[PDB]
Amino acid sequence: TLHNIITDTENVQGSFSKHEFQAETKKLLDIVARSLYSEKEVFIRELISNGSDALEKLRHRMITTAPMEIHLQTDSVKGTFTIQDTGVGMNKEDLVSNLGTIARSGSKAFLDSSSIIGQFGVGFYSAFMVADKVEVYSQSAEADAPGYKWSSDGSGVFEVAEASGVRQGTKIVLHLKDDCKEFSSEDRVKEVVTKYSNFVSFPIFLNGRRLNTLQALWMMEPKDISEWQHEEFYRYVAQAYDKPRYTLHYRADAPLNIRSIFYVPEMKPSMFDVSRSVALYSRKILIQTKATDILPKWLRFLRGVVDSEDIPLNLSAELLQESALIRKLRDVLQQRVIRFLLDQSKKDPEKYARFFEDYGLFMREGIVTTGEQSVKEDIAKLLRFESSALPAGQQTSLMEYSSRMKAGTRNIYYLCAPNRHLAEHSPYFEAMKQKDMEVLFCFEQFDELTLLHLREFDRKKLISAETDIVVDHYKEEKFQDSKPASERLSSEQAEDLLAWMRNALVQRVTNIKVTPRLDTHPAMITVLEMGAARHFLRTILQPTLEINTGHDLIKKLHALKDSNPELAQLLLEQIYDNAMIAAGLNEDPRPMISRLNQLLTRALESGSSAHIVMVDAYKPT
Amino acid sequence: TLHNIITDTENVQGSFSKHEFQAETKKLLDIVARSLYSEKEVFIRELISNGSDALEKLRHRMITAGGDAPMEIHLQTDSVKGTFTIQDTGVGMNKEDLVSNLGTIARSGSKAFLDALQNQAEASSSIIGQFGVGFYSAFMVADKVEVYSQSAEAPGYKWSSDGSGVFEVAEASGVRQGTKIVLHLKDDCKEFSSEDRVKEVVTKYSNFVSFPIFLNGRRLNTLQALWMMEPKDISEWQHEEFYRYVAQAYDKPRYTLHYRADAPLNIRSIFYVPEMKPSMFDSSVALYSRKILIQTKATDILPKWLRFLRGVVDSEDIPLNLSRELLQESALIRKLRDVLQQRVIRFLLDQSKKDPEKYARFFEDYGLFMREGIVTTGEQSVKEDIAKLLRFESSALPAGQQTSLMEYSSRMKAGTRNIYYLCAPNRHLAEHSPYFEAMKQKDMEVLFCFEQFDELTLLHLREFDRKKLISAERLSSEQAEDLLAWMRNALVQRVTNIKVTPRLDTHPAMITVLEMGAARHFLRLQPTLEINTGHDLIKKLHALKDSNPELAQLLLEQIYDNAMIAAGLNEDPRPMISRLNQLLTRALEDSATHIKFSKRDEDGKELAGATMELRDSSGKTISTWISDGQVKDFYLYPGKYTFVETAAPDGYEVATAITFTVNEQGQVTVN
Ligand SMILES: Nc1ncnc2c1ncn2[C@@H]1O[C@H](COP(=O)(O)OP(=O)(O)O)[C@@H](O)[C@H]1O
Ligand SMILES: Nc1ncnc2c1ncn2[C@@H]1O[C@H](COP(=O)(O)OP(=O)(O)O)[C@@H](O)[C@H]1O
Ligand code: BEF
Ligand code: BEF
Ligand SMILES: [Mg+2]
Ligand SMILES: [Mg+2]
């Protein structure tokens, strides 16, 4: 039944020889040049990072005055990229051991400055991605040493000679290959600096002009950032022209080190873009997330930045193609954002209402597409509704509903209608008012779908009014009519009428019934799973028609079936249609307009009238 | 104002030494085992790739120096000891090859083997390894690695290391032909001694590896790489099954494209379009190379608008990043994306011919993707490529029938080069557009674009076929004028115009709109109601406005609402139902009493030309008019009034004023 081959069979014979690992240097160089970094442009990042590190080491040495800066120069005529830093520079032994040895990083021995970027000992070789020839001039700041020129074609060997006129620091000259002339373009080189190296701690000059490098706001003390600095920084990170309506500046080292700023734009989101967002950093250097989480999909409306020292970097930079503790970070961020937004609702409900109006669709999306019930409920805390127990216009929440529920109660009742007036005057609400439960009023298009997917909240089942009305037939229909029996059809009249209606609506309705639960309305359509039926139509519903035998229209229909039978049927058809529309279960309303106009004319029938008459006498002469 | 210190101030002084690049072996091992891959689980991919390569070399040897051995990769987990073991029955390694290949970073025996083959040999395209580092991925997850290997030539060996710069080699007995690798897993990596976990990783990366893969004596990879087979030797049921696997889906593909080509690059690929339409409540095309997963969500190979496709793309010669989970930046990959874009467009176009019906359903479901593509791309040539897939309706065609921009370009009058469209919520609002009524009479055909984002699509399209798209953008004569003047006051802030028109027939009124752009924002407004003065409800409305003003208010409101519905401008009439019910009950049951006034001669025939006033008991003139040879209607409320003749026509005597009373019961008396 099983096919295995692996067995404990092997035994060592005699002694072992010991060996050291070695390297195929030529092929390592090729790997760094062609196979290590997925984008050619990052040689700029790597060289700037090296210059920044050389400057940090000098700064640190300076404590134990001169300028500390990084210069870039593009010669589009000579096809040349030059970078020069005023840092510690390198001696002969340093040029040989650090530059000449792959995976050797002098920026490690440096152990006494979380400012140091360099780690791997390969970044420098990225120059050979874009250059036939690389020359290095370095002057190890120190009374002893002289200058040096380091030189290589990138294959196999390199040569070093003593040099004069070498300024303190290091200059590196890239003779660009014809493939890569784009990096002798000033506009091109500028694009790259501001992409990866825009938060570097020393000034960078490009062809004599100082680049507008920035402060890493996310690393700084939240209380020291003014609203205006956030406005500006938002515009930078979101590449936007408006300002944030909310700003969340979150630091933690709790489960994981986190330094982050999130913004909600003041603009409403584009509906085009919704169907068609935060940057990830470490050590002030950009790190890529294409095809990665950081935030869950429903929080893609947020803009801003996340930095976490617990995220390891691969040898290139990207990495972000993971699920480890990213999934954790994402869960932490989601929780914190929900808490932030709940707090904004407390502070300023009216402002939150505007937020919810503009961004609520993201919450609904999040509830609908999550499989995790606890997450659905967390996000659900952000939803807002009106209530039958609160004045019109006043927003409430599932939490506040829960806190008004009497000790006995175990369900949350809701009603979805286009607006406050229609909900308040809904036949489904009239029926519910005979009970003493609070009803949530939900006015937005996908609120019902949302609550259907939510299903329950804090162990309380969500039930639509329409559903609850149906369920009550299968319990005690112990409800009394709104009007005394004198204002209703007698039983004999009700039965006679119903039997007529059943014949007139044979294959349109499952059954027809009187209900004591209506007041203003002549009838209503009921369906057990009303919400799901409404949802299905967005592309027969064993519907029940329930009539109010106290309503003027119903009573008139009773008469009409024996006086103008054809008019009675037209009326009946219209009452059903009106109940289907009120139920939200109506197909195209256009084909009913014909009947309605016809009905309207036949209903509306002048009379006879009283005449006052004046005679004009003729004059004589 | 500039600051530069870069100057040619250096000079080469004296002689120079030549030095060879070196390599810090210790640190480099750490880099592979720590800082190379996004996930630790990837050591399983690498070791299986190596077993596949070993097997492939053995298979190649036996073509020529034939012999008889089964070709298999075996994995074993031990959850008590915390070990992961992989064994292949491939070509194995002698002592020299263990020291050379395993002991030297970036040395690849498999690469050398590849370089010596005829490019035509099958092993040329199935050997995976290139870099000579994949093996060091074991130290990511293992404190100790043991390799037992027995070459196919004329002694077994055990290679052993902790991964800290040294390794040991000793002779070993009992080693089976091939190679066995035993990982003693780190404490934080013990999950790879779990069978279920290892199974997840094997199926993720290595499910299509050419050789049988066993785990704890059970076979895993039962899935053959359909994209490498001849399109003709694959059945519809194989596609359905493969689709479901590769898309993780449960429906069938509505469309299947099996594309092979050796052109800009080796391509073996299969694309599917799902049968199920997508929505809000919510995999991609995967990238492979030599049957191994590179990216579950391929990024650079397709344009974003084709993200609705599922399936797989495999290329043997696509340039891989060292991590094997990315592609290098490449002009070849750019060309590939362009080629695929064109192939899929070509395929969908062909499908619109073979079955326009089916393609019509496809365009309804996925058309938004095409519209997005046209808006987001910057190449005019490609915009017009994707635009060949668009369907609209036309002014020159019946309702509900689709046409392409090409078919429009077909029918155009010989002396013209302009594409006229009109983006409307619906057909009614289109056919009755002022701007379109222009193009009806003198000019000719207009595209009707009802779908959302149809507008900015064409705006972004700009130009198609070297041509330019441009948006083309009873009751008497005084009874009616009276009615109109009343209507403008009850609907003061609902419409910006009220007209009278002779169409309608069955319809008492219709809504028309000038700007379609507005109407969208409205259901995203300045309507124009137009009245049929021959319609019974309108003539009823006319009569009730004075007689039963409150009833005529409901009726008016209803006629307006009914017209907005008939124009598709109000899709959810819930706001009107309570009112409509009031209208019905009141219609089936006025306060003002109808009073008809006759001015006559001595024979009792109606007399024109008399100036008349009606005044109330206070003396106030309520109304002044001239008799015109027919009866005059008034509607008065309870009180006392007087009809006064203020001028008689020439040759007639002025009659005595007539005083009358209307009471609360609607009965009238002359006093
Ligand atoms: N501009 C510079 N000035 C001084 N030292 C430098 C400079 N650039 C590189 N180095 C030295 O060379 C080493 C190698 O650089 P690189 O290959 O990028 O590795 P790292 O990851 O250490 O930065 C560094 O560790 C540093 O000691
Ligand atoms: N299971 C095996 N059987 C025989 N040879 C192997 C096996 N695994 C690895 N090798 C040899 O070791 C070399 C190093 O493997 P690896 O570091 O993955 O580099 P590569 O990219 O060449 O596969 C291979 O080129 C191959 O010659
Ligand atoms: F700049 Be080093 F390679 F991290
Ligand atoms: F498996 Be090798 F490093 F490509
Ligand atoms: Mg560096
Ligand atoms: Mg390998």
From TrEMBL, chain B:
<feature type="binding site">
    <location>
        <begin position="130"/>
        <end position="135"/>
    </location>
    <ligand>
        <name>ATP</name>
    </ligand>
</feature>
<feature type="binding site">
    <location>
        <position position="88"/>
    </location>
    <ligand>
        <name>ATP</name>
    </ligand>
</feature>
<feature type="binding site">
    <location>
        <position position="110"/>
    </location>
    <ligand>
        <name>ADP</name>
    </ligand>
</feature>
<dbReference type="GO" id="GO:0005509">
    <property type="term" value="F:calcium ion binding"/>
</dbReference>
<feature type="binding site">
    <location>
        <begin position="108"/>
        <end position="109"/>
    </location>
    <ligand>
        <name>ATP</name>
    </ligand>
</feature>
<dbReference type="GO" id="GO:0005743">
    <property type="term" value="C:mitochondrial inner membrane"/>
</dbReference>
<keyword id="KW-0496">Mitochondrion</keyword>
<keyword id="KW-0346">Stress response</keyword>
<dbReference type="GO" id="GO:0016887">
    <property type="term" value="F:ATP hydrolysis activity"/>
</dbReference>
<keyword id="KW-0999">Mitochondrion inner membrane</keyword>
<feature type="binding site">
    <location>
        <position position="107"/>
    </location>
    <ligand>
        <name>Ca(2+) 1</name>
    </ligand>
</feature>
<dbReference type="InterPro" id="IPR003594">
    <property type="entry name" value="HATPase_dom"/>
</dbReference>
<feature type="binding site">
    <location>
        <position position="136"/>
    </location>
    <ligand>
        <name>Ca(2+) 2</name>
    </ligand>
</feature>
<feature type="binding site">
    <location>
        <position position="179"/>
    </location>
    <ligand>
        <name>ADP</name>
    </ligand>
</feature>
<feature type="binding site">
    <location>
        <position position="101"/>
    </location>
    <ligand>
        <name>ATP</name>
    </ligand>
</feature>
<dbReference type="InterPro" id="IPR020568">
    <property type="entry name" value="Ribosomal_Su5_D2-typ_SF"/>
</dbReference>
<dbReference type="GO" id="GO:0005524">
    <property type="term" value="F:ATP binding"/>
</dbReference>
<feature type="binding site">
    <location>
        <position position="50"/>
    </location>
    <ligand>
        <name>ATP</name>
    </ligand>
</feature>
<feature type="binding site">
    <location>
        <position position="109"/>
    </location>
    <ligand>
        <name>ADP</name>
    </ligand>
</feature>
<feature type="binding site">
    <location>
        <position position="88"/>
    </location>
    <ligand>
        <name>ADP</name>
    </ligand>
</feature>
<dbReference type="InterPro" id="IPR020575">
    <property type="entry name" value="Hsp90_N"/>
</dbReference>
<feature type="binding site">
    <location>
        <position position="130"/>
    </location>
    <ligand>
        <name>ADP</name>
    </ligand>
</feature>
<dbReference type="GO" id="GO:0000287">
    <property type="term" value="F:magnesium ion binding"/>
</dbReference>
<dbReference type="InterPro" id="IPR037196">
    <property type="entry name" value="HSP90_C"/>
</dbReference>
<dbReference type="GO" id="GO:0051082">
    <property type="term" value="F:unfolded protein binding"/>
</dbReference>
<feature type="binding site">
    <location>
        <position position="131"/>
    </location>
    <ligand>
        <name>ADP</name>
    </ligand>
</feature>
<feature type="binding site">
    <location>
        <position position="107"/>
    </location>
    <ligand>
        <name>Ca(2+) 2</name>
    </ligand>
</feature>
<keyword id="KW-0547">Nucleotide-binding</keyword>
<dbReference type="GO" id="GO:0042802">
    <property type="term" value="F:identical protein binding"/>
</dbReference>
<feature type="domain" description="Histidine kinase/HSP90-like ATPase">
    <location>
        <begin position="39"/>
        <end position="189"/>
    </location>
</feature>
<feature type="binding site">
    <location>
        <position position="132"/>
    </location>
    <ligand>
        <name>Ca(2+) 2</name>
    </ligand>
</feature>
<feature type="binding site">
    <location>
        <position position="135"/>
    </location>
    <ligand>
        <name>ADP</name>
    </ligand>
</feature>
<feature type="binding site">
    <location>
        <position position="50"/>
    </location>
    <ligand>
        <name>Mg(2+) 1</name>
    </ligand>
</feature>
<keyword id="KW-0067">ATP-binding</keyword>
<protein>
    <recommendedName>
        <fullName>Heat shock protein 75 kDa, mitochondrial</fullName>
    </recommendedName>
</protein>
<feature type="binding site">
    <location>
        <position position="93"/>
    </location>
    <ligand>
        <name>ATP</name>
    </ligand>
</feature>
<dbReference type="GO" id="GO:0005759">
    <property type="term" value="C:mitochondrial matrix"/>
</dbReference>
<keyword id="KW-0143">Chaperone</keyword>
<feature type="binding site">
    <location>
        <position position="179"/>
    </location>
    <ligand>
        <name>ATP</name>
    </ligand>
</feature>
<feature type="binding site">
    <location>
        <position position="101"/>
    </location>
    <ligand>
        <name>Ca(2+) 2</name>
    </ligand>
</feature>
<feature type="disulfide bond">
    <location>
        <begin position="423"/>
        <end position="449"/>
    </location>
</feature>
<feature type="binding site">
    <location>
        <position position="46"/>
    </location>
    <ligand>
        <name>Mg(2+) 1</name>
    </ligand>
</feature>
